[PDB]
Structure formats: structure tokens, C-alpha cells
């Protein structure tokens, strides 16, 4: 049901200004060339859909051995790929990001919530740029170096 007078198009939480930056960063973060796909929003989904790439990202950050996803193989298998995505998320949260923002394995694999994952990533970068490890790559401007505040100790 269209709003009517105020609201021509859907108020989706997707942006084409951040997508362009993502592909630019992701491709950078990862040393090797995963295969910088098209800048379109139709491919991006397929890029991470497989899962491989995603791994290259989280793996690019953490140092040798520290990387959460050591095994990285592009298994055409539909069952494999999906699971391949979780391998990243599992560490995505443990890294610092909040599960309340993290997308779902299917949300991306099937591209149901391309708006969610499209953001979940941006957070991965903004957080890294807030660290002092000196691993993060690509222009630090892309993501905000702003600092957030956490609650009370565990409990």
C-alpha cells in the first residue's frame, strides 16, 4: 500500500552510495584478487552469495593464523556456499559487530535482505578503522572512525 501523498517510492534501507564504496574496500582489504565483479547491485549479491569472498574479508583483517576462516574453497554446492557465509558471520559478531545488525545466511544467499548485509559490512570497516592493530586496509575515510560506547561488563 503506497503512502499516497507523501511517499512515492519505498523507504528501503538500501543505498547506492555505500555499495560503490563496499566493492572498492572489500576488493582492497583482500590481498589476492577475488574477482572484483560489476559495480551493479545485482552482482554484489552473487559476490558474497557464494561466501568465499566474505571469508577473504574477515581473513584479510586478522593476521596469519588469527584468521577465523582458514579453509576457503568455492564449492558450487548450494548447501556448501550457504554454510560458507556463516563461517564469516560467526566471527563477525565475535569481532565486535552486533548480532542485531548482522544479516542472515539466507538474507544474502537468496538476496532477501540485500539491505541488511549491505550494511553489516560497512560496520566491519568502520570498526576496524577504530582499532590500533594497523591491519585494516583501504581509505579510512570510507568508514567513520567515530567511537562508540558499550554498556556494563558482562552480566
CATH class of 13-144: mainly alpha
Distance CA 105, CA 84 (A): 9
Q: Look up residue 63 and give its three cell numbers.
A: 593476521
**Sign of the torsion angle spanned by Cα atoms 145, 93, 88, 22:** negative
> Which residues touch 43 (CB under 8 Å, ≥6 apart)?
37
Query: Domains of the chain: which residue ranges?
Result: 13-144
Nearest to 128 by CA among 104, 85, 97, 90: 97
**Sign of the torsion angle spanned by Cα atoms 22, 85, 68, 145:** positive
Residue 136 has, within 13 A of its CA and on its CB side, a CA count of: 20
What element of type H or E holds 44? Answer: helix 41-49
Contact 118, 108 (CB under 8 A): no
Amino acid at each position: 500500500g503506497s503512502s499516497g501523498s507523501s511517499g512515492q517510492k519505498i523507504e528501503k534501507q538500501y543505498d547506492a552510495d555505500l555499495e560503490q564504496i563496499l566493492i572498492q574496500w572489500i576488493t582492497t582489504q583482500c590481498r589476492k584478487d577475488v574477482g572484483r565483479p560489476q559495480p551493479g547491485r545485482e552482482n554484489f549479491q552473487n559476490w558474497l552469495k557464494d561466501g568465499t569472498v566474505l571469508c577473504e574479508l574477515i581473513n584479510a583483517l586478522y593476521p596469519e593464523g588469527q584468521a577465523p576462516v582458514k579453509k576457503i574453497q568455492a564449492s558450487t554446492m548450494a548447501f556448501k556456499q550457504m554454510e560458507q557465509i556463516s563461517q564469516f558471520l560467526q566471527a563477525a559478531e565475535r569481532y565486535g559487530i552486533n548480532t542485531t545488525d548482522i544479516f542472515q545466511t539466507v538474507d544474502l544467499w537468496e538476496g532477501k535482505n540485500m539491505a541488511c548485509v549491505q550494511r553489516t559490512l560497512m560496520n566491519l570497516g568502520g570498526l576496524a578503522v577504530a582499532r590500533d592493530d594497523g591491519l585494516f586496509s583501504g581509505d579510512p575515510n570510507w568508514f567513520p572512525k567515530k567511537s562508540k560506547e558499550s554498556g556494563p561488563s558482562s552480566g
